[PDB]
Design an enzyme around this catalytic site. Sequence first.
Site, mmCIF file in Angstrom:
data_model
loop_
_atom_site.group_PDB
_atom_site.id
_atom_site.type_symbol
_atom_site.label_atom_id
_atom_site.label_comp_id
_atom_site.label_asym_id
_atom_site.label_seq_id
_atom_site.Cartn_x
_atom_site.Cartn_y
_atom_site.Cartn_z
ATOM 1 N N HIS A 96 -63.703 -87.719 44.360
ATOM 2 C CA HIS A 96 -63.397 -86.533 43.566
ATOM 3 C C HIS A 96 -63.679 -85.281 44.386
ATOM 4 O O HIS A 96 -64.373 -85.337 45.400
ATOM 5 C CB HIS A 96 -64.141 -86.522 42.217
ATOM 6 C CG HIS A 96 -65.601 -86.223 42.310
ATOM 7 N ND1 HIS A 96 -66.507 -87.089 42.883
ATOM 8 C CD2 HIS A 96 -66.321 -85.172 41.856
ATOM 9 C CE1 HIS A 96 -67.723 -86.584 42.774
ATOM 10 N NE2 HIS A 96 -67.637 -85.421 42.155
ATOM 11 N N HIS A 148 -65.672 -82.815 44.889
ATOM 12 C CA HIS A 148 -66.970 -82.143 44.870
ATOM 13 C C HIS A 148 -67.612 -82.179 46.252
ATOM 14 O O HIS A 148 -67.400 -83.118 47.024
ATOM 15 C CB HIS A 148 -67.918 -82.790 43.856
ATOM 16 C CG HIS A 148 -67.849 -82.189 42.481
ATOM 17 N ND1 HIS A 148 -68.519 -82.725 41.405
ATOM 18 C CD2 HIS A 148 -67.186 -81.101 42.013
ATOM 19 C CE1 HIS A 148 -68.273 -81.992 40.330
ATOM 20 N NE2 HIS A 148 -67.470 -81.002 40.671
ATOM 21 N N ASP A 208 -70.439 -82.997 47.441
ATOM 22 C CA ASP A 208 -71.100 -84.220 47.883
ATOM 23 C C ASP A 208 -70.118 -85.327 48.284
ATOM 24 O O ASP A 208 -70.510 -86.300 48.935
ATOM 25 C CB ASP A 208 -72.086 -84.720 46.810
ATOM 26 C CG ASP A 208 -71.401 -85.147 45.524
ATOM 27 O OD1 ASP A 208 -70.586 -84.370 44.981
ATOM 28 O OD2 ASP A 208 -71.692 -86.265 45.049
ATOM 29 N N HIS A 248 -66.789 -87.406 34.694
ATOM 30 C CA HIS A 248 -67.667 -86.499 35.417
ATOM 31 C C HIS A 248 -66.823 -85.302 35.852
ATOM 32 O O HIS A 248 -67.284 -84.159 35.843
ATOM 33 C CB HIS A 248 -68.261 -87.207 36.629
ATOM 34 C CG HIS A 248 -68.901 -86.276 37.605
ATOM 35 N ND1 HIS A 248 -69.986 -85.490 37.284
ATOM 36 C CD2 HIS A 248 -68.570 -85.960 38.878
ATOM 37 C CE1 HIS A 248 -70.293 -84.728 38.315
ATOM 38 N NE2 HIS A 248 -69.449 -84.993 39.295
ATOM 39 N N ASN A 291 -73.820 -81.772 36.417
ATOM 40 C CA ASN A 291 -72.903 -80.672 36.157
ATOM 41 C C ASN A 291 -71.816 -81.134 35.210
ATOM 42 O O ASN A 291 -71.040 -82.024 35.555
ATOM 43 C CB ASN A 291 -72.257 -80.213 37.463
ATOM 44 C CG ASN A 291 -71.223 -79.118 37.255
ATOM 45 O OD1 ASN A 291 -70.406 -79.176 36.332
ATOM 46 N ND2 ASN A 291 -71.241 -78.121 38.131
#
EC number: 3.5.2.6
Length: 220
Positions: free
Chosen positions: A79, A81, A83, A142, A173
């Site tokens: 995804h 993000h 990280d 998420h 988040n």
Amino acid sequence: TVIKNETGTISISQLNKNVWVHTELGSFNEAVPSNGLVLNTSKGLVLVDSSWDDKLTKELIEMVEKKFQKRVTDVIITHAHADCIGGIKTLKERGIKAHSTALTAELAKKNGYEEPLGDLQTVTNLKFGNMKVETFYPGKGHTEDNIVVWLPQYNILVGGCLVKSTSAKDLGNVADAYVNEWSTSIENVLKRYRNINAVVPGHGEVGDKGLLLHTLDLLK
Ligand SMILES: [Zn+2]
Ligand SMILES: [Zn+2]
């Protein structure tokens, strides 16, 4: 078997024969670990997710290429993000193919990151040497674009950030999350893979199917 850098911010632990878990500690609000996988195949190294940024990602890559004396050929971005896609720039300059769904590519761009391939469909099966990898988009959770990765030869599921670790009491988040849909997406994963052995959460220790149930519990 665990292996780290002088700093202790990057470590790789053997899960099975050719499957290792890489974890990097980002420095923010302080150390937050993030997991990914390192797949040692006969044709090179394949990673599931990069790291928080280009410095960590480059270090991670340098570490595994040295350890296995192979080239990291592909990376699966679960995804958009930091990280996960944080080191996309490092990947592109090293000729590493950054696989992702078209949606992840679109969101990556929207978030100021360089764009991954956007090649992954809802169900995509990749084989590197003798290493089989399946990517699956279970629906929004998420994030809108989160996908999971399944290694059928080991029945290992990389739930990524759609799955919380055993000690996690927070969802993290949720500003970009679809909380109400999250549960349905986890059920789609549970219905699809009914013989899950190990489950790798986006953050925390590897567990089993119980982690998905734990996450559903947090979502209730
Ligand atoms: Zn995330
Ligand atoms: Zn995460």
